[PDB]
Design a protein around this ligand. Sequence first.
Ligand SMILES: CC[C@@H](C(=O)Nc1ccon1)c1ccccc1
Length: 186
Amino acid sequence: SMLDDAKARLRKYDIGGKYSHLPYNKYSVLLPLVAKEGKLHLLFTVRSEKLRRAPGEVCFPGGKRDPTDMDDAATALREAQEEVGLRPHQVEVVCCLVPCLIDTDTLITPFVGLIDHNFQAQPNPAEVKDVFLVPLAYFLHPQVHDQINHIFEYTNPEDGVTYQIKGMTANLAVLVAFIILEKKPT
Ligand SMILES: CC[C@@H](C(=O)Nc1ccon1)c1ccccc1
């Protein structure tokens, strides 16, 4: 099936806990895969205009590890619940992808999760201004704008609203698309 095929591809890139104990400032992100209308989509947040770090930017759900978290996957799931109302029974964590090093002292660990078909996002307005889906296939043929820094522009055909996706967030979206969609019979 579509979903079994995606998880099988993803597992081949799982690094597991290999880099998890190193002495960094630690953050996790959840890359949430949603199936709709026979295709896979990624779920993105727009950060509230009132936040300290990067107000109004497009990001995946995530945040800083705290002492309660059993592991890095737990960080991602706790944060996703707080931001968009995703409960643990509503997500299957499939793997841990290559981590992102920043600022010489920070390590960000990305997890890919498959989302239940009955999940409906409840944006927490203290943290998130908006939540939206993008088809995974978009990231194979994006609409690119050069700011040089490459920026993706996605327009939602339901309402005509355009979102800008850039940086680590855009890079991780492309990676997931390549892993799942490369070399497929039509
Ligand atoms: C690790 C932090 C995460 C984030 O802050 N997620 C949030 C917060 C409110 O809404 N979405 C993120 C992911 C990707 C790029 C920048 C930041």
